[PDB]
Every structure is written in C-alpha cells, then in structure tokens.
C-alpha cells in the first residue's frame, strides 16, 4: 500500500499522480510547486484523508504541477482508477468521499490558508502545533508536546525561515519554557497558551 517516507521526490513538474496516490496515512503534508517554487506544505495529508486531487484535474495528463514529500512513512493504496472508479462514476459511494477528499485536504489547508495569511509566522507555528504536536501524542516535556523529533531549523524550512525565526523566536519560547530541545518536545505546557 502506497507508502512514502520523507527526503523524497513525490510530485514533480508534470506529474502523472492520477492513478491514485490514494494517501491513507501520514502525519504530513502536500508540498506543492510551481515556477517561483515554493514547494511548501501548501497542503497536507496526515492519516485520514486521501489524494486524488489534481490527479482528478484534466486527469492523467493535466497540467499537474506540484511536488510533495513527507516526514512520515506515509500510507496510501495498492490499486488504479478502479477503487476510485467505483467512487467516481458508478455512484456516489466514494464519490461524496471524492468531494470530501478536497474538503478533507484542500479545505483542511483552507483553514490553515486563512490563518497562514498572518503577519508573524509564530502564529502559524502555534496553530500548526495546536493541531498535531498536541493531539495525537501526549503533551510531554513542558506541555502540548511537539509530538515528535524534527529540528529547530524545522521553522527554518517550514515557511523557509532564515536563521531568524530561529534562536530569536526559540529564545522567546526558551524564556517561557514552552520549548524542549530534548527529543524536540519544544512546547507550551498548555494548548490554549500560545493559541491565546
């Protein structure tokens, strides 16, 4: 079942990602692209949604122009336009799910979309951490734990910080012990805290 780790290349320029990526699990992201570039988690998929997104544009040869990779050993299918094909033509069985797919990944980002559009990025970080680091693990070191080990330059890549939102922002959070270098727990003791 289609199952992808980090440090990869999943979409490309031009992809045929039509026949389903069919993402089932990750805790992770659609990096996108286009020309100016920014292959950013310009969407996401954790466990519980599914691709089939620009794969369902003009379809198997649209102008499919993204590129994504994980940090999770993503989980995602072993079939072609069949399980979807049911889902597409023969009914709304997983047709509503097809629509849901967009409303479960595009619209998922849509929320982060009206929120990533803020001045300081710390907000986007706190939001992101409010949903993920908190929930699907236990708020360990100093509170709503980073729910994994990543990097302090994570922000430096997530949003593309320039060794600036790093040590400075970290500094602030080091001052309010809402951080934990150890196993990258880095976090407020309480979810509401930085969520204000």
């Amino acid at each position: 079942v289609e199952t992808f780790e980090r440090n990869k290349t999943i979409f490309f320029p031009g992809d045929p990602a039509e026949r389903v990526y069919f993402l089932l699990k990750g805790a992770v992201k659609l990096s996108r692209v286009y020309e100016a570039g920014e292959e950013i988690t310009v969407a996401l998929l954790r466990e519980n949604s599914v691709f089939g997104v620009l794969s369902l544009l003009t379809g198997n040869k649209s102008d499919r122009f993204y590129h994504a990779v994980a940090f999770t050993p993503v989980e995602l299918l072993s079939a072609p336009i069949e399980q979807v094909e049911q889902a597409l033509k023969e009914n709304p069985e997983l047709s509503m799910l097809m629509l849901r797919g967009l409303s479960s990944r595009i619209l998922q980002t849509e929320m982060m979309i009206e929120t990533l559009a803020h001045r300081d990025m710390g907000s986007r970080l706190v939001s992101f951490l409010l949903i993920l680091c908190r929930d699907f693990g236990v708020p360990c070191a100093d509170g709503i734990t980073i729910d994994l080990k990543l990097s302090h330059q994570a922000i430096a890549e997530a949003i593309g910080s320039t060794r600036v939102t790093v040590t400075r922002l970290l500094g602030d959070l080091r001052e309010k012990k809402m951080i934990s270098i150890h196993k990258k727990k880095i976090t407020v003791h309480k979810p509401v805290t930085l969520s204000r």
């Binding site: 490309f12 320029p13 031009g14 692209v33 286009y34 020309e35 570039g37």
Partner: peptide, 8 residues
C-alpha cells in the same frame, strides 16, 4: 540545482 528543474 533549481535553474534546471522547474520543468522549463
């Protein structure tokens, strides 16, 4: 390293 990849 990107001056060659965006497919153009």
């Amino acid at each position: 390293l990107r001056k060659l990849r965006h497919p153009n």
